[PDB]
Structure 1
Amino acid sequence: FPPNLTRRYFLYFKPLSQNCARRYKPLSVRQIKGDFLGQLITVRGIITRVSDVKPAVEVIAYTCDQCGYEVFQEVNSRTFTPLSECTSEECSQNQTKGQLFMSTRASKFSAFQECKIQELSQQVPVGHIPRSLNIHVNGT
């Protein structure tokens, strides 16, 4: 079993305060250039049209049902593809392969929800229309 398959926990990063930065960030949506991908940011705004929380599939278990093994499919993308009838170590090199199917109790989920953030309408230019932006929320 991979250790990613057995986690039960999560890890959260932690931002630095501006006081120690003063000793040793106020951004706008317009200031969010589409070139800062992968960086660390800090925004502010208005929560608008909050969606609802629905479960997110993480890993897929696959019961052998013939040889009695368990095949595992980890999915980090939005979609994926179905796999074969069995991927056991014993179903292979044999005439009669198994037949798998997924399972619910052996799969792992995660909290997933998103919403939209509207501009402050005080930092908006005099002749523009305010934009909005999607922010994903996960876990705790």
Structure 2
Amino acid sequence: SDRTNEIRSENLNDALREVVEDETELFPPNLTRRYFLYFKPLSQNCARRYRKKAISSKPLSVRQIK
């Protein structure tokens, strides 16, 4: 808001946004998030219904992981 006002001051509504965006320094997305994101494997029950092969919910030993 500050820089939009100051840019309107000298009088050098779309390109104004692209000017302000580049002219200013802001906090990036990461330092304003507060949530975490995880993935839940593909269930075998669901993969056997729509006819798909679930590589994810298949368990594995420690030797088999190459």
Measured against the shorter chain, the TM-score band is: 0.3 to 0.5
TM-score by length of 1: 0.22
> Quick check: which one's helix share is greater?
2
Higher relative contact order (CA 8 A, sep 6+): 1
**In proportion to residue count, which structure has more strand?**
1
State the TM-score, normalizing by the size of structure 2.
0.43
